[PDB]
Design a protein around this ligand. Structure first.
Ligand SMILES: [Ca+2]
Length: 223
């Protein structure tokens, strides 16, 4: 996250870290045994880390549970990033409290102009590399589809949206991928791609979760 603030320990209780010997992508806890992430984070051998604040210190609230199964969206296209969404089932159900909780799936798509919260452990610089060890948060608006398509001519599909600031300075960044964008207490986005971070006229691009709800629910019901 570039340009954001330190969330504070377990203030974002649905936020997960996907670990394969190291933190590589974020994710969102959607019920006790399922996590939603970005299809571009797919790896074999993922462990899910819940209850984290400082990913490099064991502080007391953590649950580390291996993934049993990972499902990439049937239509995921790695060259376009269209349908950049993945389901991970946990080997065991998580124990859900105030500090480890699931986030609700949306009923409606959120509109341009809505303010959302984006969080993760990604790079905090627009030029060069500096990874935080604690969880970083950004409030940012959803931009209009017009402003989005006009920043990224030819590249935006119906299953994406932009959010952030055309002036730059504040965005998501490398390592924040697969993490949540939550608006009005619902999961509306997944951190997916962008051109660099926090650059002028190159907002972050996010998977539009409200398009996938029927897919999510059907998959979870059957697996
Ligand atoms: Ca920790």
């Amino acid at each position: 996250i570039v340009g954001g603030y330190t969330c504070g320990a377990n203030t974002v209780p649905y936020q997960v870290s996907l670990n394969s010997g190291y933190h590589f992508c974020g994710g969102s806890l959607i019920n006790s045994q399922w996590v939603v992430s970005a299809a571009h984070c797919y790896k074999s051998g993922i462990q899910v880390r819940l209850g984290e604040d400082n990913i490099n210190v064991v502080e007391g609230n953590e649950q580390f549970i291996s993934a049993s199964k990972s499902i990439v969206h049937p239509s995921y296209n790695s060259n376009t990033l269209n349908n950049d969404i993945m389901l991970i089932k946990l080997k065991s159900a998580a124990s859900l409290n105030s500090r480890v909780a699931s986030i609700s799936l949306p009923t409606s798509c959120a509109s341009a102009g809505t303010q959302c919260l984006i969080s993760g452990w990604g790079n905090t610089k627009s030029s060069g590399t500096s990874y935080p060890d604690v969880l970083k948060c950004l409030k940012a608006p959803i931009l209009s589809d017009s402003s989005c398509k006009s920043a990224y001519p030819g590249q935006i599909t119906s299953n994406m949206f932009c959010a952030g600031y055309l002036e730059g300075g504040k965005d998501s960044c490398q390592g924040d991928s697969g993490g949540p964008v939550v608006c009005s207490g619902k999961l509306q986005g997944i951190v997916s791609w962008g051109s660099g971070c926090a650059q002028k006229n190159k907002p972050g691009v996010y998977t539009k979760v409200c398009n996938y709800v029927s897919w999510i629910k059907q998959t979870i019901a059957s697996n």
